[PDB]
Amino acid sequence: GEAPNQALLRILKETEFKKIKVLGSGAFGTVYKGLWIPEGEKVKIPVAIKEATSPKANKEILDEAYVMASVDNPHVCRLLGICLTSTVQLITQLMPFGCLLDYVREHKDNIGSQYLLNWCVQIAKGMNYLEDRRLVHRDLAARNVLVKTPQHVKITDFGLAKLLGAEEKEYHAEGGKVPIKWMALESILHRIYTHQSDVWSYGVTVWELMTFGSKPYDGIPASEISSILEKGERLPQPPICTIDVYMIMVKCWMIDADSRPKFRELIIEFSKMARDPQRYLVIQGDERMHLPDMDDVVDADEYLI
Amino acid sequence: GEAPNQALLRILKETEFKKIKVLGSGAFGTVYKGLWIPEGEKVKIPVAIKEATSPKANKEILDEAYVMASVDNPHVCRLLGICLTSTVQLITQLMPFGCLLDYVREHKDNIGSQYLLNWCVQIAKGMNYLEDRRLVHRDLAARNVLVKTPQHVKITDFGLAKLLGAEEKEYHAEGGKVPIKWMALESILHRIYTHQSDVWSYGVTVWELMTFGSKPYDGIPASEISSILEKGERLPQPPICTIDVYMIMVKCWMIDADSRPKFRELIIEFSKMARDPQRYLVIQGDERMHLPDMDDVVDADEYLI
């Protein structure tokens, strides 16, 4: 059949956390910034605690947990565990600088080509890793990438992720709210998802970064996209983008999914470019830009089982 | 490192074209004659639309696009843009009179020295320009030169073109179908390409024109050329060629690449000769030869970004 998923789902005690401050609130629920202090061992771990109780809700959050607990890569958010209190709580590694989309918007004037190209590589590594685990993200976007530090980002939000069977190359899903502006044509017309359709979204993510946080098809309404993409149109070339970099985005947008590049290739291409950043991204004043008890604090990346 | 290629790759909408008639068909795919009518602006642009879908194919056509979009000279075909429909489409400026090779064959009895010598100059200008852009064509031949008008030709077909790095004077390629009869010795023996090896091919192109479309080494099979060129032999002197003009071809065929003339020199030499055409080309009846809605039609050369 398929390989036995032997991941471990850790269940934590409510008394092992110290919600220090609220971070988010609205949509699904409320997110907290806090510390995880496992009993005994002198270690304090910065975490993001995501906490009403509706069978519809719980059902979904546990699924995210199934997925997060199954992944293990430096460029994918690590799940620390869950807490089964009145209302369920997902405990993940704290990503202090928030999501990339907000970060590029809030820091434009200080983000140079080295950072842009390196993020591209890191994300491609994360995605290539998810491909190995035969996992289709289905919602890759600048907003779903968190910032541990300006030098280290991680792919997150698996609330739509899917694990493809042994040899189930596609994924036929049903109705439901979907980020249309980030999806391949085949997903808008036949609600099909593949690793290659993830590449398309990767392409749009890269575009979001290059444009420093612009909005895909800013103006055009969701219902037209399908029409526009068929007409042969695609997102415009970002101002800082050399034809080399934009030439790669465009490819991620081929109609023929098998014509698009594979994450392992995007990794190679961007790695080369990242070796001479100023040759592929023209950013004004590029070279002159700079980007960034607790005695027993340890990053989640250093706390291992 | 190297200079940032800031060319713009324009992506056009399928609904902006009017394929008027087919032009070619076979080899790679099918070429169409048509009009490009950008939405709004009252302009109609005559274009050549080059349109199955195989990852091997698309990969190559996009590369041609990378190159064409990177060039900008009056003697090099201008890329108008591409269309990302089911199957990719390269949109270039329409060259009504076809390629030069066919043209000289079809018009012999009406092509005089003024035209011959002026084409030579124009091509040399195109090639000299590609040298500036540190670009090695690798497939210069009478068939790869299009005719916008009998007075204006342009270098085309960059399906083998290469962009040499900062100080990468040579280009070591691998196996693959190659126009052997048009290549320097060093390219047949060590698959090396340089601007100087482009000169060799230029020499053979000039020879093709002077002989009005003859076939290089007409008879001798590909496998012998290498042998023949080493023996000290070269293409014969064309009937209309004075020793002055043929003396220039021969030079382009030196074994010592650095002994061959440079495109900027071929430009000077032919320009001088073009000032008194009948002194360098003896063509019978030379002096008596003559060579050649749409209300908002504008040539691509007049439509600028």
From Swiss-Prot, chains A, B:
The lineage of its organism: Eukaryota, Metazoa, Chordata, Craniata, Vertebrata. It comes from Homo sapiens. Belongs to the protein kinase superfamily. Tyr protein kinase family. EGF receptor subfamily. The gene is EGFR. The modification N6-(2-hydroxyisobutyryl)lysine is found at K50. ATP binds at L23, G24, S25, G26, A27, F28, G29, T30, V31, K50, T92, Q93, D157. Receptor tyrosine kinase binding ligands of the EGF family and activating several signaling cascades to convert extracellular cues into appropriate cellular responses. Known ligands include EGF, TGFA/TGF-alpha, AREG, epigen/EPGN, BTC/betacellulin, epiregulin/EREG and HBEGF/heparin-binding EGF. Ligand binding triggers receptor homo- and/or heterodimerization and autophosphorylation on key cytoplasmic residues. The phosphorylated receptor recruits adapter proteins like GRB2 which in turn activates complex downstream signaling cascades. Isoform 2 may act as an antagonist of EGF action. It comes from the Eukaryota. Ubiquitously expressed. Isoform 2 is also expressed in ovarian cancers. It is found in: Cell membrane; Endoplasmic reticulum membrane; Golgi apparatus membrane; Nucleus membrane. The chain holds residues 696 to 1018 of 1210 of the full protein. This is Epidermal growth factor receptor.
